[PDB]
Write a protein that binds this ligand. Sequence first.
Ligand SMILES: Cc1cc2nc3c(=O)[nH]c(=O)nc-3n(C[C@H](O)[C@H](O)[C@H](O)COP(=O)(O)OP(=O)(O)OC[C@H]3O[C@@H](n4cnc5c(N)ncnc54)[C@H](O)[C@@H]3O)c2cc1C
Length: 449
Amino acid sequence: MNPKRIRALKSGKQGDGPVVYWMSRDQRAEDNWALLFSRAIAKEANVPVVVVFCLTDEFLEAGIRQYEFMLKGLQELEVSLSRKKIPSFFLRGDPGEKISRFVKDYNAGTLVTDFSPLRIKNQWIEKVISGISIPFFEVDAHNVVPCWEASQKHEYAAHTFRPKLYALLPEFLEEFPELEPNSVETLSDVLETGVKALLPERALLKNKDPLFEPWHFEPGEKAAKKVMESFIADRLDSYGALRNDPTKNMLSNLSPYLHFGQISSQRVVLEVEKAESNPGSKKAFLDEILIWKEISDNFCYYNPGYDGFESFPSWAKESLNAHRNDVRSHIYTLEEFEAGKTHDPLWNASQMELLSTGKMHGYTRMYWAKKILEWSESPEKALEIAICLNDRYELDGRDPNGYAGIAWSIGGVHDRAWGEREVTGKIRYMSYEGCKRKFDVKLYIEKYS
Ligand SMILES: Cc1cc2nc3c(=O)[nH]c(=O)nc-3n(C[C@H](O)[C@H](O)[C@H](O)COP(=O)(O)OP(=O)(O)OC[C@H]3O[C@@H](n4cnc5c(N)ncnc54)[C@H](O)[C@@H]3O)c2cc1C
């Protein structure tokens, strides 16, 4: 148990009651350092470990697709924690008021949470800390190398992050010890009432018939294991050569599970490393799941304004500002962008895939966010438009990967300066003709009418 994984947010009188794990990011029972450390703290005090998960007033900003995925996995997680003699409690309200009241009504001895770098979690922590006196710990249960330990500053490129992370990989890439067992209404009720509130906001194709297709990704820890095994056995060999072809789904499709913490990324990394495949495909996949995923936490953790023009690199701010007054080829409102009402059939196909499946191909994720920059009055409104559609419609959205990916596409964050254009300046450019050379755009457009 590496102590560099756990940080202290409040040092108080170490309480005399159950250690409470505040699940936020990692919604799984296996391979969870926050769950394995809380048990270790529990055993050192002879008190049973418990889990509390808060259902917040911020789900109504997303849709049914995200609400169902999370709650269905929780129903499976609740059963799993029961079989390990850990009781799971679910509260519906403000985490600051709900958690503070809970630790008092149950005589919590120690409080543990998993690590999110997002602004909304720092908001919740501010409230809880001001109303509790027991010690408050957090564990990075989502990154292979803990976010604060990998780097002490914000990195400007991946070629600088890849040595700093791989030099610490032997310290932190290791097997999970098992979760030894211990010595506010039903979830189905909450799913029922939540669906009703969100229902008249459901995305609808034309009229009546809804747009989302929930049969693409089953939620839960067990489904994620089947996904990862199917990727390694069937899709890992050709990852490095086919990841950039949207006509073929040769990606791991792990992001909906990764975002909700329904499978630990290190569990993925251990099995990839031990498996024989195309060595280049292994090299390409490991870079995405270790370098680019864990640098996204670094961007969000070390930039308080990660979702604004303020966090862009200086060369990109200077270039974009010099082109704010250029004429734009087209301008679309958010409502037009949502429905896929653009003059680009490649963009409209990309939007239609997101609406239908809640997951959009990683390659077109760059084209789709750069045309938003090309068709917006200012880069600021483009950042808002890109954030709005991503968080609303992506299964894996509302994630540090999303903001880092969007900041990469719009402001060149973790990228370099390129040849100047109008409107977009030095930012990397992706043309309609360029995508035709790399993959058969005809099938992708037809597949999503
Ligand atoms: C503008 C934009 C927005 C994005 N929004 C999100 C998002 O909200 N949530 C999200 O999880 N990913 C986002 N992605 C990152 C990336 O596209 C997805 O991780 C990936 O496409 C998800 O599908 P996959 O699991 O089949 O990827 P795979 O090719 O199978 O890679 C596996 C994992 O590596 C990680 N990864 C892969 N590519 C990237 C990347 N470019 N940056 C960071 N991590 C990466 C992902 O965690 C991914 O799950 C975004 C990318 C861009 C360019």
